[PDB]
Amino acid sequence: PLSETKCTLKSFTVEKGIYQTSNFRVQPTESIVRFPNITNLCPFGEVFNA
Amino acid sequence: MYICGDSTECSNLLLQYGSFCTQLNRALTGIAVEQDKNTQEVFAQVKQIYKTPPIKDFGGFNFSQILPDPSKPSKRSFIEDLLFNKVTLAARDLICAQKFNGLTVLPPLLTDEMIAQYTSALLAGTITSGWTFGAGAALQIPFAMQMAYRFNGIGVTQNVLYENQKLIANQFNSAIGKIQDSLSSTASALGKLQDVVNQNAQALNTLVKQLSSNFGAISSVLNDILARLDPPEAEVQIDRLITGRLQSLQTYVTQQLIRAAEIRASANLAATKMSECVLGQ
Amino acid sequence: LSSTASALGKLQDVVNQNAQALNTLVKQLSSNFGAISSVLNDILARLDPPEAEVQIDRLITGRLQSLQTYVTQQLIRAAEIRASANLAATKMSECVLGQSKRVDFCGKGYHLMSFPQSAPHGVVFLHVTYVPAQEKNFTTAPAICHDGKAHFPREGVFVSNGTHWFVTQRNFYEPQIITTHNTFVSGNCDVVIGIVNN
Amino acid sequence: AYTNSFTRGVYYPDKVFRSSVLHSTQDLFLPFFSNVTWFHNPVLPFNDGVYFAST
Amino acid sequence: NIDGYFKIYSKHTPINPQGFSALEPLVDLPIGINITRFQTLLAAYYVGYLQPRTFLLKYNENGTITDAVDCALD
Amino acid sequence: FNGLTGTGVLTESNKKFLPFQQFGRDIDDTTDAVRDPQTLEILDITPCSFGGVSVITPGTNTSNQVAVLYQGVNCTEVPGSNVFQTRAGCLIGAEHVNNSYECDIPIGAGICASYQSIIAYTMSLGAENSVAYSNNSIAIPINFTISVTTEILPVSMTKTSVDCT
């Protein structure tokens, strides 16, 4: 991180204190998709198993 | 995060407008450090922490409703508790101040109990030693003689105090009880603080509310627009949304700068009053 | 002053803020702003007027936005500097040209005098102040009962060193004997709380 | 008769839950303190919605 | 009826006008017809008509509507 | 979930949805809870954490050690050195003591780190003393000193002019 502070201040010496470097975000790992129960499916065997 | 919202093409479009984020963050950080300096210079007027004597015989005056008590955990006095309960609009419900859109509330540098310790130190010093603790080191002096010296400074001879000590003590006790009751019962007495809080909250709310406007594009959400059209010709709408949100952000920052200026003026006035009317006459 | 640094923090901060604002104004001239090139000459001399108009319009609106922002920031900063200059004018009018009886306005202690000095873009005051030291205890009393009457001090306070009673001024220990010329009488003493025979 | 619909006819505009807030909506409502044409059959018009009460 | 969807709300059977009670949706039907008139089957029924308006609704602590005010009355 | 798309952390909740209601909402039209269409249960939604980092340094002239403070994140999902959990975020690389010194790098909520090894502790307002208040005693100085101070005040800044064209 010291190199990051040196970048942000644009100097090769940094005085005593607290500095802000950047921000981070937690990256999502998984994708979840949900849909209701599969019911009343289209009749297909009534024109085949007739 | 506020403008784009986690999309690579939006970031690619945005990075070519210059370095607006840099000066925005610089302005906000300047405001925050100014606030910390405000509080520090208002309260920290003393070097040590004087403590009230265990035995209280202040010539008949009764201070028990201002000096802190040990039963409460926060070590705040009675009037301070009335004033804290009256401002309705942090235990453990913390580390949860962030919102869905990128915006955060940083915690103040001086915790409430430290401010309580400061005011207790100031008030015990001025009860025991007078004003001499603002010039050099505290020098004790009984309260009756300090009150006689304080009469003698408005042109009233000091005979008037020692033959009317009981009348004055009774009037002071009655007046302090009366102010306690008036503050406890009557509401709408803390106008200034509540107005400040309401103004800040309303500005934040309208800033958030502004996020859901078409601005002349197809829609108000980037994902739908980028997923419905083609990248060669879906960049104009993204550009429109970027420009609109930049405009709203600049407006909000400027309003905060103005308000911070006026609060700074008020803090300076409070520091002057606290230095000239408490630590002296 | 000569050895230690960082005393002149405020003036240096002002200069740094102004320099940074000007630099970030100048630096905004290389941004594309949605056009096809940052430089105006090539884009003017490389395409037809119908599209050159659009590109130049985008560049113009971007640059106007940047310039407006810079002007507004300058106005805010000038306002705060004006407030500070008014405070300095007041302080020089009151503490240099006269003695200030208002507490903690000029220094820490009682005020005696001030001397001003210049600086690059500011002023520097050298206040001179009085500060006591080496205290003691003694034993006080509000009145003295003599012949049934109560005597109070004109200016000063009664103290005792163990055996005798004296009147001394508040801010310095210079004991004096008690005579009628520096004490005044008011009524009998059966109502004052802490009278002492003498 | 032409009795007055005092405060009748507010219906949940949508399926979004919401708790202890005050919302402002723009929707097709029956205005407060209006006349309802009592009846006792005619082919009444429809003209974008109808409230129908009975007892 | 709005853009192809025919919506029927209701409050079914309140037990005793006057008062306040919101109406919860029952059915939505996706057809879409040029519709202009209607007629009941076989008895006295009050009838009222709906028009665009702006309302302010106060939701309960449990998601139920407990109060509402008009916005163009007085 | 059933059309609506978003990013977040799903938690078991205890809301009281009405049967015809599908998904909840907040004050500012930001989704808060959703009913899952498989078992009819309520799931609260919490956005994934963020927060700017910061670096605490004692100055390159002294040493090259730093302590990294993450702001406003429960210090469990941060990923080396001692991990300190405070009320302003969490510190990495700074050891915690049980004392109180007046401090010089304030980081917040009463905590403020300083160099020794980079420790982090709680402020101490001042040396706690008590004056022996008695109702018949005073304290009169017997000597004095004369002290000279300074004050620095800016009065003007640089004048600049810019031509628009």
Ligand SMILES: *[C@@H]1O[C@H](CO)[C@@H](O[C@@H]2O[C@H](CO)[C@@H](O)[C@H](O)[C@H]2NC(C)=O)[C@H](O)[C@H]1NC(C)=O
């Ligand atoms: C969707 O289907 C699943 C599985 O067919 C149902 O889950 C079962 O629900 C019954 C309720 O009568 C329970 O007794 C079973 O224990 C459940 N089994 C499992 C594996 O979950 C679910 O209830 C159905 N939901 C809807 C809304 O139709």
Ligand SMILES: *[C@@H]1O[C@H](CO)[C@@H](O[C@@H]2O[C@H](CO)[C@@H](O)[C@H](O)[C@H]2NC(C)=O)[C@H](O)[C@H]1NC(C)=O
């Ligand atoms: C100074 O004022 C306080 C505040 O009233 C007095 O405390 C009261 O004490 C009496 C007797 O102990 C109680 O009955 C009251 O309830 C107390 N007041 C409150 C508000 O609780 C205190 O007594 C006063 N000082 C002296 C020396 O009497």
Ligand SMILES: *[C@@H]1O[C@H](CO)[C@@H](O[C@@H]2O[C@H](CO)[C@@H](O)[C@H](O)[C@H]2NC(C)=O)[C@H](O)[C@H]1NC(C)=O
């Ligand atoms: C001066 O005013 C005070 C109160 O403002 C008077 O004191 C009151 O006198 C009455 C009658 O003697 C008593 O019942 C009250 O208890 C007193 N009040 C207090 C607080 O002690 C006083 O009498 C007035 N003096 C003159 C000369 O008018």
Ligand SMILES: *[C@@H]1O[C@H](CO)[C@@H](O[C@@H]2O[C@H](CO)[C@@H](O)[C@H](O)[C@H]2NC(C)=O)[C@H](O)[C@H]1NC(C)=O
């Ligand atoms: C308090 O001060 C008085 C006045 O100076 C002291 O009285 C004198 O003390 C000196 C010696 O300390 C003697 O030589 C004088 O004769 C004393 N004067 C008289 C009139 O008797 C007194 O001693 C001091 N108190 C103490 C405890 O030293």
Ligand SMILES: *[C@@H]1O[C@H](CO)[C@@H](O[C@@H]2O[C@H](CO)[C@@H](O)[C@H](O)[C@H]2NC(C)=O)[C@H](O)[C@H]1NC(C)=O
């Ligand atoms: C100052 O000193 C004390 C402070 O509490 C009090 O003096 C008491 O006075 C009574 C009656 O005169 C005596 O019975 C006590 O023994 C005294 N106590 C002490 C410690 O001296 C009173 O408040 C004040 N006394 C004087 C004389 O001013």
Ligand SMILES: *[C@@H]1O[C@H](CO)[C@@H](O[C@@H]2O[C@H](CO)[C@@H](O)[C@H](O)[C@H]2NC(C)=O)[C@H](O)[C@H]1NC(C)=O
């Ligand atoms: C100060 O002197 C007066 C005058 O002698 C004293 O007053 C006497 O007190 C005694 C005892 O209380 C009484 O018996 C007398 O009647 C009072 N009067 C006279 C003329 O003697 C007073 O007590 C003295 N006080 C002190 C602290 O020494």
Ligand SMILES: *[C@@H]1O[C@H](CO)[C@@H](O[C@@H]2O[C@H](CO)[C@@H](O)[C@H](O)[C@H]2NC(C)=O)[C@H](O)[C@H]1NC(C)=O
């Ligand atoms: C909102 O709903 C909750 C939970 O359904 C209610 O809280 C409890 O509901 C049970 C249901 O019989 C009662 O027996 C309890 O007395 C309720 N407790 C409390 C603290 O209210 C709540 O009452 C409902 N609020 C309404 C309907 O306004």
Ligand SMILES: *[C@@H]1O[C@H](CO)[C@@H](O[C@@H]2O[C@H](CO)[C@@H](O)[C@H](O)[C@H]2NC(C)=O)[C@H](O)[C@H]1NC(C)=O
């Ligand atoms: C960071 O998150 C953890 C996990 O939730 C917190 O530890 C729990 O905190 C809750 C209160 O928020 C307690 O009821 C649990 O007993 C804690 N331990 C568990 C769940 O194992 C931790 O407090 C959070 N850190 C904070 C808030 O600073």
Ligand SMILES: *[C@@H]1O[C@H](CO)[C@@H](O[C@@H]2O[C@H](CO)[C@@H](O)[C@H](O)[C@H]2NC(C)=O)[C@H](O)[C@H]1NC(C)=O
């Ligand atoms: C005046 O007398 C008081 C009481 O005798 C002194 O206060 C105490 O001084 C002793 C000196 O050893 C300390 O140990 C105590 O802690 C002091 N009391 C308190 C409450 O702090 C006081 O120091 C004397 N004044 C001077 C100038 O010596």
Ligand SMILES: *[C@@H]1O[C@H](CO)[C@@H](O[C@@H]2O[C@H](CO)[C@@H](O)[C@H](O)[C@H]2NC(C)=O)[C@H](O)[C@H]1NC(C)=O
């Ligand atoms: C008041 O303080 C001053 C110094 O602050 C004392 O003067 C010093 O006295 C010592 C002892 O003789 C000398 O060595 C110094 O040279 C003196 N300083 C100066 C500047 O002259 C002075 O004595 C103190 N007052 C009293 C009454 O003791």
Ligand SMILES: *[C@@H]1O[C@H](CO)[C@@H](O)[C@H](O)[C@H]1NC(C)=O
């Ligand atoms: C007809 O029945 C057979 C089972 O005998 C099944 O495998 C087939 O899928 C059915 N036809 C259709 C169209 O489903």
Ligand SMILES: *[C@@H]1O[C@H](CO)[C@@H](O)[C@H](O)[C@H]1NC(C)=O
């Ligand atoms: C209903 O109509 C009658 C007459 O047709 C009229 O007097 C009355 O004011 C109307 N009610 C309202 C609420 O306008």
Ligand SMILES: *[C@@H]1O[C@H](CO)[C@@H](O)[C@H](O)[C@H]1NC(C)=O
């Ligand atoms: C009504 O009929 C017109 C044609 O006359 C058609 O354009 C429109 O879509 C129809 N709408 C409905 C709701 O049936």
Ligand SMILES: *[C@@H]1O[C@H](CO)[C@@H](O)[C@H](O)[C@H]1NC(C)=O
């Ligand atoms: C670096 O400079 C600072 C400036 O005050 C000084 O305090 C420190 O001791 C210096 N470090 C070394 C190693 O000399």
Ligand SMILES: *[C@@H]1O[C@H](CO)[C@@H](O)[C@H](O)[C@H]1NC(C)=O
């Ligand atoms: C501080 O003291 C407590 C109790 O004495 C102890 O449990 C804790 O470990 C100490 N902390 C440190 C950093 O030594």
